[PDB]
């Protein structure tokens, strides 16, 4: 377990296991003080005598540290100078049991070091977005709205009616970068809000007054009302200074919110 | 709302916009505040809302600015009762309203310029009150003269009158003239400008005319800032101004040149900001800085009479500044001159938190005053009255005596009446000797002199130093100190060209004989090189100076 | 006049008897050679001027005889008739001492206890309790046998030591030395001292001049210092005089602690210390009333070092009338806290939150400086003392690894128990007043000697520290400050140590570079061996100009600094990964901020140096309006001392019965809002901890925490303050009050109310409340990952 | 704790010892109060 590995030429294995004639597997349970997001397990065999390297390694992980669960079938490890077992899906692990198979051609198993690499939930050690967020839909909508300008109008008209679309785009606008830069979200909100006056007023209410949704219904409770960023400021300015039939009404709404606030 | 609160600033920006739409509302505003009892909140609100052409015109026509200025002057010399606590709020109020060029002209007008002297007299009060008033006054003057030639002239005149240098006045001079001018730049673009922005919340409450969103930006940059730096702060992109319609601006113009053009193009002087558009003549002189205006009135000579970088170098700079026209030669390197001026005022920082010695091109500072003085002397010939005037004042202040003392200390000679560290010190001293010899030669024979000049140069270390240096029989040794030997030969030629200084060459082991021997050595070396077959520019120097010195000595001997 | 006062002080001086007295003692007392006793600390260099103990000092070890517990008599014949100033009766007790013995020590003359009743007429020094002489070590001490009768005389004496291991048997070791009055040119000097000791009018007039109630209050600061010197001698010699000081105590405290410098307070502290050490009314109540009566004037105190001694004395005497100190401090603290909150500037708040910097760089006026009740105090009145290495032992040297740069001696070969020395040349005779050497574990002991001309010419031993391995050397406000120029530090390596290289922090030294004519006077010391004001003012003006320039730099750099509120995910990322430009802005701000703090210290030192010179010249240094006009730094210092006083009050605790009419819900809220939000970390911490100890057990306490949480962390709050630091305090406060059932109840009610919209939600407010509630509950393994 | 030996000459060695005891006792009380 020592953080500093032994010398690469350390002539004696730091740890050795003598196999009884009827024993095929030896086990090493590493209990951690608290659960961590385990991502990789590194095992360093004694490089001077690789005949004592385990033939295979079966990794079991316990999130609670009590009920071990094999990650997969044992990995063939004979002939490897370094054993790097990467978990494709990081697993919460408070204990790790390594079951090392007797070497093919040796009665003793020699190991140098075991590393359990990973992360903690918080602290200094806590170091495809589209797949884990809803941003892909917004990127699709932005592509439809902006890729072909001549169709923008139609696209916006098809997109404006859907309930809670503007609230959702505003929520994605104010969230930390999640695979879509804020300017594209701003473009979506502005182009949707400009296709008719009613949704311009709704968007103004969302940005200034009430951004909450209008167990399956969208809620969007997570964000404070009226919060401003460079994004909201740009959206509001383009709405105000855009020349169209609704311009007057939008300005009216703005002034209304001003008076209400005062 | 309480004063200075950002929300109050935003509400006041809304009021400013409404006043700009309905100027008459502004009149109503002033009616609602009593335009007497003006609180600091009233002043803040009026200053914010008054930032419009119509609004500023009505504010001026209300008489409130005049009443405030007169009341402040009356307070300083001790129609509204003004106390010391309201002075700083009133100075800030005047500063904010002076953002407009019209109010900037008014504050710099005849009726108000007495208030400037009143404040300066008042400061040259409780300690906290005095500090607040000092800060407000410095800010007020900086705003008044900011890119405003008329107010720069007025403040320079007031300061010159004040002097006819420690405490508040030194700080004021350092902050106002010894710091680079900063102008607010207003950038418009047809496309958003994202560079320089942070995703976090930032409340930049500027004047609404500076816009909002990603297509508008407002920067506060030194007038020395190049346009390329401005663009790099926001992002091929080209900067345009409405006045210079349809003509791309070079990216290296710098804001001083742009201001020169805009004032040439009738932009009102003291306009709050430079409004450029981001779309997609270098010889023009930069606009005169407050330091340049102040010096153009002969202020730098006045400063010198009231005054690692060697201390002796600083003393020499302080002494040379008293000469007529030395300041004009000095200001050809604006940044280095500013650094030196800060140095002589007991300030080591270059105004941006960086120690001057650790600043860029600090190695030219130690010898810069002498180079400037040599340039000054070289352009003033004996025949013109100015040459005699300059030489006489140089002798009077003690420039020649100090030069000779430095020569004695640096060449290690005396008046006639680790390893690498020592080597580099010797090399620096050799450069000092070279520059001093060139300075003396220019002072003698610029590119007439007091008859007592020979007495000084004879009682000086000059003769021992020249005699020791001329006793060199190795031409290769001369090749290793080409600048020093070139300066020595120039001095010998200048002396031999002045019959009243020639006696310094003939025996008092004369210098001229040593020069002749060095000429013989160089000719023999050249003959040896021919037989074998930076001395290139040095091998004619020795010949020419030897020929001239020998001719002068022979002419003198025939004269005898 | 200055001459009469100077004459009196010279009269009060002392010398040690050059020839040793003879002593006869019971057989159980066995003498020890002075060389043996002083083996650890030899006096052979002092032997030249008869300073060593072998020429004048006698020593006896106690033999546990049959009657060793009973009377002991040291019969002491002087070498010659002389004006005896006092007899020093030193004693060292066994370390394993269960109880302090009841032994009376008295001085008699050769031809109450039975022996003393018979020898009643021969008594020269009344019965002195043995315990009165104890040292801090617990097993040590000394009695300075003296009295008016001893001064009023001029061949043999008796020291009678009788115990009323038992009694004197616990007295392991005793030693006696005799000190005479210095020989003075004053005529009939014996008659002059007799006059001072008898006449009361002398004492009353001394008090008046100290209080500046005489000669039109034109008494110079040096004159007041001399008066205290005379007063110290009177109290030591005597033990009615107490009545004069006690009747005028308020004015004495006022002038000496609120209108004088650190030295006067230290001297006044010494004078008051002696008075306490003395059938009269209890002195504690009288001193407390004076200190409490002047407490309201603390905002107007002149120097921090002066206030330090004031609060030190009050802390000792607070045990009487606990309510008065508590109520006075509470009233003043509440009064001063309001102004402190009102004086916070938006720029100061930004620095506290974004950077954790709690000084006032824009407020030029400091009140106190410390280096480190465990640190040197009042260091604004003294100058940092620069020095240059001139000579060293072996291959040792110094390296740098206005204030002097931190310097340490690097020694190439330390060995074990090996002595090395370094000689420091200040470049001039400097009035040395304060010294601080960081603890050095590489050496066992450290000796400091000082000399102006040469070590063997006028060499003086400043100090020897034997616990320098476990404590730093701290010399605070030397009352007879040396006038040395050269400083030899001799360090003895640790025993059982072979560290090749040694790094001994040299430390810090303070004092003055302009000795006043009377300060340098070699006649005013024991056992000897105006233009500047103009120059100092010129320097002070320069520092004012530069410090204002530095302060302006800080404002310009900060005016472009913006603090995102912690109310959104984007703001959370800003705090998680500071962007490079944000990092650079903090670096520039920190560099610029350091410049302001450095210049602020220099400006106060320059002001303090100029004031010292203007104080050498005849001059004087200067209720709610006082707080109005006080400096910010003075208020913070006053609160710290008051908070510490209240904290010691609670620790030393009927004091809880009082402080309930005050420190109610609003006052607790007022105190917390004013001090914990905007105060310094120590003030913040102490205010929070103080609030817990006082009101943590009140029913409304939990509501106060929730209300504070609501008011400070709701998203409608625009107040800028260190939420994280204040939140850590709140988490700490709740943990220390979590025994009060109302804490968690109210916190969950806030969480209940905040979540009511589900059954608008304020997510940032909920986050703060949940984290606070989570940390508090876990204090009340699968979740150890959190 | 490690007083300067020059205080023994006068009558102020006990006074200085008592002041330091005052300062040290107060410091201990603050530390103890803060560490409840």
UniProtKB/Swiss-Prot annotation, chain D:
Signal peptide: none annotated. Coiled coil: none annotated. Expressed in brain cancer cells. Ubiquitinated; mediated by RNF41 E3 ligase and leads to proteasomal degradation, impairing inhibition of apoptosis. Deubiquitinated by USP8/UBPY. Autoubiquitinated; mediated by E1 ubiquitin activating enzyme UBA6. It is found in: Golgi apparatus, trans-Golgi network membrane; Endosome; Cytoplasm, Cytoskeleton, Spindle pole; Cytoplasm, Cytoskeleton, Microtubule organizing center, Centrosome. Homodimer; antiparallel. Interacts with RNF41. Interacts with DIABLO/SMAC, likely with higher affinity to SMAC dimer than SMAC monomer; this interaction blocks the substrate-binding site and inhibits the caspase inhibition activity of BIRC6. Interacts with KIF23/MKLP1, USP8/UBPY, BIRC5/survivin, MAP2K1/MEK1, RAB8A/RAB8, RAB11A/RAB11, PLK1, EXOC3/SEC6 and EXOC4/SEC8. The BIR domain is essential for its anti-apoptotic function and is important for binding to DIABLO/SMAC and caspases. Belongs to the BIRC6 family. Anti-apoptotic protein known as inhibitor of apoptosis (IAP) which can regulate cell death by controlling caspases and by acting as an E3 ubiquitin-protein ligase. Unlike most IAPs, does not contain a RING domain and it is not a RING-type E3 ligase. Instead acts as a dual E2/E3 enzyme that combines ubiquitin conjugating (E2) and ubiquitin ligase (E3) activities in a single polypeptide. Ubiquitination is mediated by a non-canonical E1 ubiquitin activating enzyme UBA6. This is Dual E2 ubiquitin-conjugating enzyme/E3 ubiquitin-protein ligase BIRC6. It comes from Homo sapiens. The lineage of its organism: Eukaryota, Metazoa, Chordata, Craniata, Vertebrata. The gene is BIRC6. The chain holds residues 2565 to 2600 of 4857 of the full protein.
């Amino acid at each position: 377990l020592q953080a500093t590995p032994p010398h690469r030429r350390a002539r004696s294995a730091a740890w050795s296991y003598i196999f009884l004639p009827e024993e095929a597997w030896c086990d090493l349970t590493i209990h951690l003080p608290a659960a961590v997001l385990l991502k990789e397990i590194h095992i360093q065999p004694h490089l001077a005598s690789l005949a004592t390297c385990p033939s295979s390694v079966s990794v079991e992980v316990s999130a609670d540290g009590v009920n071990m669960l094999p990650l997969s079938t044992p990995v063939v490890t004979s002939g490897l100078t370094y054993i790097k077992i990467q978990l494709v899906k990081a697993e919460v692990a408070s204990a790790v049991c390594l079951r090392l198979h007797r070497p093919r051609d040796a009665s003793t198993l020699g190991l140098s070091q075991i590393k359990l690499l990973g992360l903690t939930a918080f602290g200094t050690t806590s170091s495809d977005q589209v797949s884990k967020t809803s941003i892909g839909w917004l990127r699709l909508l932005h592509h439809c709205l902006t890729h072909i300008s001549d169709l923008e109008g139609m696209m916006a008209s098809a997109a404006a009616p859907t309930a809670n679309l503007l609230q959702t785009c505003a929520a994605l606008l104010m969230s930390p970068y999640c695979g879509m830069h804020s300017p594209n979200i701003e473009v979506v909100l502005v182009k949707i809000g400009l296709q008719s006056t009613r949704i311009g007023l709704k968007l103004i209410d969302i940005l200034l007054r009430n951004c909450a949704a209008s167990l399956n219904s969208p809620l969007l409770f997570g964000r404070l009302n009226g919060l401003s960023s460079d994004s909201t400021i740009d959206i509001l300015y383009q709405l105000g200074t855009t020349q169209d039939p609704g311009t007057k009404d939008r300005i009216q709404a703005l002034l209304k919110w001003v008076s209400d606030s005062a | 709302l309480p004063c200075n609160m950002v929300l109050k600033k935003a509400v006041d920006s809304l009021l400013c916009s409404m006043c700009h739409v309905h100027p008459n509302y502004f009149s109503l505003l002033m009616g609602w505040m009593g335009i007497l009892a003006l609180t600091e909140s009233h002043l803040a609100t009026l200053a914010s809302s008054s930032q419009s052409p119509e609004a500023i015109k009505q504010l001026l026509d209300s008489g409130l600015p005049s009443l405030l200025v007169r009341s402040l002057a009356s307070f300083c010399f001790s129609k509204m009762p003004i106390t010391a606590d309201l002075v700083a709020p009133i100075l800030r109020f005047l500063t904010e309203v002076g953002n407009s060029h019209i109010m900037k002209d008014w504050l710099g007008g005849s009726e108000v310029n007495p208030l400037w002297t009143a404040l300066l007299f008042l400061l040259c009060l409780t300690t906290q009150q005095r500090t607040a008033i000092e800060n407000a006054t410095v800010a007020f003057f900086l705003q008044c003269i900011s890119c405003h030639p008329n107010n720069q002239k007025l403040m320079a005149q007031v300061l010159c009158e004040l002097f006819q240098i420690s405490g508040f006045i030194r700080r004021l001079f350092l902050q106002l003239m010894l710091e680079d001018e900063k102008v607010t730049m207003f950038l418009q673009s047809p496309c958003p400008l994202y560079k320089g922005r942070i995703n976090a919340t930032s409340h930049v409450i500027q004047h609404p005319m500076y816009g909002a969103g990603h297509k508008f930006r407002t920067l506060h940059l030194p007038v020395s800032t190049t346009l390329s730096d401005v663009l790099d702060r926001v992002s091929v992109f080209h900067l345009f101004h409405k006045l210079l319609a349809g003509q791309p601006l070079p990216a290296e113009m710098t804001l001083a040149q742009l201001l020169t053009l805009l004032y040439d193009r009738k932009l009102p002087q003291g306009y709050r900001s430079i409004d450029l558009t981001v779309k997609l003549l270098l010889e023009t002189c930069p606009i005169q800085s407050p330091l340049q205006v102040f010096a153009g009135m002969g202020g730098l000579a006045l400063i010198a009479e009231r005054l690692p970088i060697p201390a002796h170098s600083l003393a020499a700079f302080g002494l040379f500044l008293r000469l007529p026209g030395y300041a004009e030669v000095l200001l050809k390197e604006r940044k280095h001159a500013q650094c030196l001026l800060r140095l002589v005022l007991g300030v080591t920082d270059d105004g941006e938190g960086s120690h001057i010695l650790q600043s860029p091109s600090a190695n030219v500072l130690p010898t810069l005053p002498f180079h400037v003085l040599r340039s000054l002397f070289s352009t003033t010939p004996l025949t013109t009255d100015d040459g005699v005037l300059l030489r006489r004042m140089a002798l009077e202040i003690g420039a020649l005596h100090l030069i000779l003392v430095c020569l004695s200390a640096l060449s290690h000679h005396s008046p006639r009446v680790d390893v690498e560290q020592a080597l580099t010190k010797q090399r620096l001293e050799e450069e000092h000797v070279t520059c001093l010899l060139q300075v003396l030669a220019s002072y003698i024979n610029p590119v007439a002199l007091p008859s007592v000049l020979l007495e000084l140069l004879s009682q000086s270390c000059l003769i021992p130093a020249m005699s020791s240096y001329l006793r060199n029989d190795s031409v290769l040794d001369m090749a290793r100190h080409v600048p020093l030997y070139r300066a020595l030969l120039e001095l010998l030629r200048a002396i031999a060209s002045c019959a009243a200084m020639v006696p310094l060459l003939l025996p008092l082991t004369s210098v001229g004989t040593l020069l002749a021997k060095m000429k013989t050595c160089v000719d023999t070396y050249t003959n040896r090189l021919r037989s074998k077959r930076g001395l290139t520019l040095l091998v004619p120097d020795i010949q020419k100076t030897a020929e001239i010195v020998y001719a002068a000595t022979t002419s003198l001997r025939q004269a005898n | 006049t200055l001459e009469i006062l100077t004459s009196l002080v010279e009269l009060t001086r002392f010398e040690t008897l050059t020839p040793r007295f003879s002593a006869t003692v019971p057989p159980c007392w066995v003498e020890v050679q002075q060389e043996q006793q002083q083996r650890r600390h030899p006096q052979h260099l002092h032997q030249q001027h008869h300073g060593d103990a072998a020429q004048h000092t006698r020593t006896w070890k106690l033999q546990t005889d049959s009657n060793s517990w009973d009377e002991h008599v040291f019969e002491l014949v002087l070498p010659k008739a002389c004006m005896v100033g006092h007899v020093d009766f030193k004693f060292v007790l066994n370390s394993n001492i269960t109880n302090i013995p009841q032994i009376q020590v008295t001085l008699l003359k050769n031809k109450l206890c039975p022996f003393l009743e018979d020898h009643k007429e021969d008594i020269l020094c009344g019965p002195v309790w043995l315990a009165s002489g104890l040292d801090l070590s617990g097993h040590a001490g000394m009695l300075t046998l003296t009295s008016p009768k001893l001064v009023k005389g001029m061949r043999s004496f008796l020291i009678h030591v009788k115990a009323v291991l038992r009694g004197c048997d616990l007295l392991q070791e005793v030693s006696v030395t005799i000190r005479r009055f210095k020989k003075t040119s004053i005529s009939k000097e014996r008659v002059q001292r007799c006059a001072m000791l008898q006449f009361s009018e002398f004492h009353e007039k001394l008090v008046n001049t100290l209080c500046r109630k005489t000669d039109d209050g034109q008494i110079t600061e040096h004159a007041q210092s001399l008066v205290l010197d005379t007063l110290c001698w009177l109290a030591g010699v005597h033990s009615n005089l107490l009545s004069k000081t006690r009747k005028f105590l308020s004015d004495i405290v006022r002038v000496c602690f609120f209108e004088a410098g650190r030295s006067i307070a230290h001297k006044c502290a010494r004078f008051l210390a002696l008075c306490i050490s003395n059938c009269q009314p209890a002195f504690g109540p009288v001193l407390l009333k004076a200190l409490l009566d002047n407490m309201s004037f603390l905002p107007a105190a002149t120097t921090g070092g002066s206030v330090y001694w004031y609060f030190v004395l009050l802390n000792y005497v607070k045990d009487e009338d606990l309510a008065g100190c508590s109520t006075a401090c509470a009233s003043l603290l509440t009064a001063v806290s309001r102004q402190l909150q009102d004086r916070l500037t938006p720029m100061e708040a930004l620095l506290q939150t974004r950077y954790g910097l709690y000084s006032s760089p824009f407020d030029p006026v400091l009140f106190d400086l410390e280096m480190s009740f465990t640190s040197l105090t009042g260091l604004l009145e003294v100058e940092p003392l620069h020095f240059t290495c001139v000579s060293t032992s072996d291959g040792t040297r110094i390296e740098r690894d206005q204030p002097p740069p931190h310097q340490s001696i690097i020694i190439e070969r330390m060995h074990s128990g090996a002595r090395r020395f370094v000689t420091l040349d200040f470049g001039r005779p400097i009035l040395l007043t304060d010294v601080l050497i960081p603890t050095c574990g590489d050496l066992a002991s450290l000796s400091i000697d000082i000399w102006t001309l040469g070590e063997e010419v006028d060499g003086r031993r400043l100090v020897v520290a034997t616990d320098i391995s476990t404590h730093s050397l701290i010399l605070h406000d030397l009352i007879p400050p040396p006038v040395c120029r050269f400083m030899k530090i001799t360090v003895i390596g640790r025993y059982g140590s072979t560290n090749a290289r040694a790094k001994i922090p040299l430390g810090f030294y303070y004092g003055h570079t302009y000795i006043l004519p009377w300060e340098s006077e070699l006649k005013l010391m024991h056992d000897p061996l105006d233009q500047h004001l103009a120059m100092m003012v010129a320097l002070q003006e320069d520092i004012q100009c530069r410090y204002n320039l530095a302060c302006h730099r800080l404002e310009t750099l900060l005016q472009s600094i913006d603090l995102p509120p912690l109310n959104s995910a984007n703001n959370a990322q800003y705090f998680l990964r500071k962007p490079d430009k944000a990092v650079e802005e903090d670096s520039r701000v920190f560099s610029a901020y350091q410049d302001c703090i450095q210049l602020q210290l220099q400006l106060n030192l320059a002001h303090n140096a100029v004031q010292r010179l203007k104080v050498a010249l005849g001059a004087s240094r200067k209720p709610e309006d006082l707080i109005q006009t006080s400096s910010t730094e003075q208020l913070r210092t006053i609160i710290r001392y008051l908070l510490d006083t209240l904290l010691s009050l609670l620790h030393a605790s009927s004091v809880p019965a009082v402080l309930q009419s005050t420190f109610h819900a609003q006052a607790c809220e007022e105190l917390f809002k004013h001090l914990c939000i905007s105060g310094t970390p120590k003030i913040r911490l102490h205010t929070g901890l103080l609030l817990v100890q006082l009101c943590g057990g009140e029913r409304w306490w939990g509501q106060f925490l929730s209300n504070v949480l609501q008011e400070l962390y709701n998203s409608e709050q625009l107040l800028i303050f260190p939420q994280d630091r204040v939140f850590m305090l709140l988490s700490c406060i709740g943990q220390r009050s979590l025994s009060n059932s109302g804490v968690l109840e109210s916190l969950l009610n806030l969480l209940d109310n905040l979540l009511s919209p589900l059954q608008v939600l304020d997510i940032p407010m909920i986050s703060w409340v949940v984290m606070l509630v989570s940390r508090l509950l876990d204090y009340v393994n699968q979740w150890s990952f959190i | 704790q490690a007083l300067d030996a020059r205080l023994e000459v006068g009558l102020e060695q006990q006074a200085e010892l008592m002041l330091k005891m005052m300062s040290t006792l107060e410091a201990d009380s603050i530390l103890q109060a803060l560490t409840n």
